[PDB]
Amino acid sequence: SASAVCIPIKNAGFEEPILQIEDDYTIDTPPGWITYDPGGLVPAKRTRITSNNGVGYTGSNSEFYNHKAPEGRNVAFVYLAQEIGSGIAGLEQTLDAVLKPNTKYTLTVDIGNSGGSFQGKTLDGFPGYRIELLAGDTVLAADHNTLYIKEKDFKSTTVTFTATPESPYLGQHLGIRLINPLQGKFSGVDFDNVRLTAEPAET
Amino acid sequence: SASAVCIPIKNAGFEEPILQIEDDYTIDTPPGWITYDPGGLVPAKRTRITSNNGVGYTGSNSEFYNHKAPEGRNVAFVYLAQEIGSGIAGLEQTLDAVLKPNTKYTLTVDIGNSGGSFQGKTLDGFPGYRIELLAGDTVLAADHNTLYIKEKDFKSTTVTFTATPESPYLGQHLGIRLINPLQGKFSGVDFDNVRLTAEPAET
Ligand SMILES: [Ca+2]
Numbered sequence: 351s352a353s354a355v356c357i358p359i360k361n362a363g364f365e366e367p368i369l370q371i372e373d374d375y376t377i378d379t380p381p382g383w384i385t386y387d388p389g390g391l392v393p394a395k396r397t398r399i400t401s402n403n404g405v406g407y408t409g410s411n412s413e414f415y416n417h418k419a420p421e422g423r424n425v426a427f428v429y430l431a432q433e434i435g436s437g438i439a440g441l442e443q444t445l446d447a448v449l450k451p452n453t454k455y456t457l458t459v460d461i462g463n464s465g466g467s468f469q470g471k472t473l474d475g476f477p478g479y480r481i482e483l484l485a486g487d488t489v490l491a492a493d494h495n496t497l498y499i500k501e502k503d504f505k506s507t508t509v510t511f512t513a514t515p516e517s518p519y520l521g522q523h524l525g526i527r528l529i530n531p532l533q534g535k536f537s538g539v540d541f542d543n544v545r546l547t548a549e550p551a552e553t
Numbered sequence: 554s555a556s557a558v559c560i561p562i563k564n565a566g567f568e569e570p571i572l573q574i575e576d577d578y579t580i581d582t583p584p585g586w587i588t589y590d591p592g593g594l595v596p597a598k599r600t601r602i603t604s605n606n607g608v609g610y611t612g613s614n615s616e617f618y619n620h621k622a623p624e625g626r627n628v629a630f631v632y633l634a635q636e637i638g639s640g641i642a643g644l645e646q647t648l649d650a651v652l653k654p655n656t657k658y659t660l661t662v663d664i665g666n667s668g669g670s671f672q673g674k675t676l677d678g679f680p681g682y683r684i685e686l687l688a689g690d691t692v693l694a695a696d697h698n699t700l701y702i703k704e705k706d707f708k709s710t711t712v713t714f715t716a717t718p719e720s721p722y723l724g725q726h727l728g729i730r731l732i733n734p735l736q737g738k739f740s741g742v743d744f745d746n747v748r749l750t751a752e753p754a755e756t
Pocket residue numbers: 363364365419420421422423424425542543
């Protein structure tokens with residue numbers, strides 16, 4: 351951890367684009383990230399009532415969380431309007447760094463369970479979450495909904511992965527997926543503070 | 554964890570059938586479990602060199618592990634002969650228990666990275682592992698290859714899951730999957746000591 355190094359990630363805290371009004375949010379894919387929608391659940395033209403993703407201002411007076419964003423003023427969100435078990439969707443980003451042998455990777459991200467209500471619709475419930483670390487288009491490691499996150503709360507999850515010399519994915523581009531697996535309603539989940547460190551692998 | 558109860562699992566330590574010779578093994582789906590092969594990588598007629606699974610005696614004089622099986626004398630194993638990325642396969646078991654609200658489930662299983670060599674073929678390498686907790690046919694929680702297990706070693710992994718009263722899977726039968734995701738060679742991974750506890754969810 352003392353010799354840990356950070357792997358560069360674009361818009362890691364979803365601080366772009368800048369917002370100012372409490373509870374304000376966009377419905378466009380946050381800059382630096384791309385929408386992960388293998389089942390085409392996110393419409394070409396998005397509206398506030400369709401499946402969508404974006405950044406949301408989360409200050410100390412947020413209606414959805416007891417505290418402000420874990421990092422900065424913004425958190426990213428992924429909302430799916432389809433029925434439970436209809437599929438999965440989220441944010442994804444390919445990194446410049448490649449997988450190196452004898453290296454332990456530590457991927458940490460804060461998961462938010464929005465609570466309260468919006469326009470008469472309750473935010474009670476949670477669709478779960480899944481964090482993935484990739485090499486190429488292969489999922490090296492993932493944590494699927496193991497954390498318990500209370501409503502209006504944010505919780506840190508950690509995904510580790512050690513690349514050995516026998517790995518077949520050495521030299522492939524690293525990647526990160528923030529997924530909403532749609533396993534419950536209200537089907538919205540927030541993320542923030544994406545961090546990816548690398549260090550010498552365990553002896 | 555003091556008021557935690559265990560959920561019944563058949564042949565949880567793969568202690569049946571009984572074996573007596575060091576490193577001896579079977580190639581039949583361990584009793585109490587069923588083979589998980591959605592892509593059909595396991596041929597109907599199994600042989601010692603085809604993709605297979607079964608139980609293997611792992612004592613204190615094993616040629617493939619530094620220590621004895623984490624529990625009892627046997628361990629389960631899942632071998633895939635196919636090339637890396639051809640698919641996943643493993644062991645699955647539906648439990649009599651059903652998902653209950655306000656309950657935190659703890660699924661623990663020891664994962665083995667067999668090492669050494671046999672007939673000039675190295676055991677070096679690991680195909681990774683995935684532990685899943687289910688309700689019906691839905692994966693509620695899972696740990697995908699986040700643990701670093703040295704060769705000839707066993708390491709325990711934990712998958713937690715909290716069911717809220719808002720869960721849409723309440724009353725569905727619990728399930729467990731031990732998966733070989735074929736993300737490396739030697740593509741053999743062992744499992745042992747499957748435990749599933751239940752306790753009142755945190756407040
Ligand atoms: Ca932020």
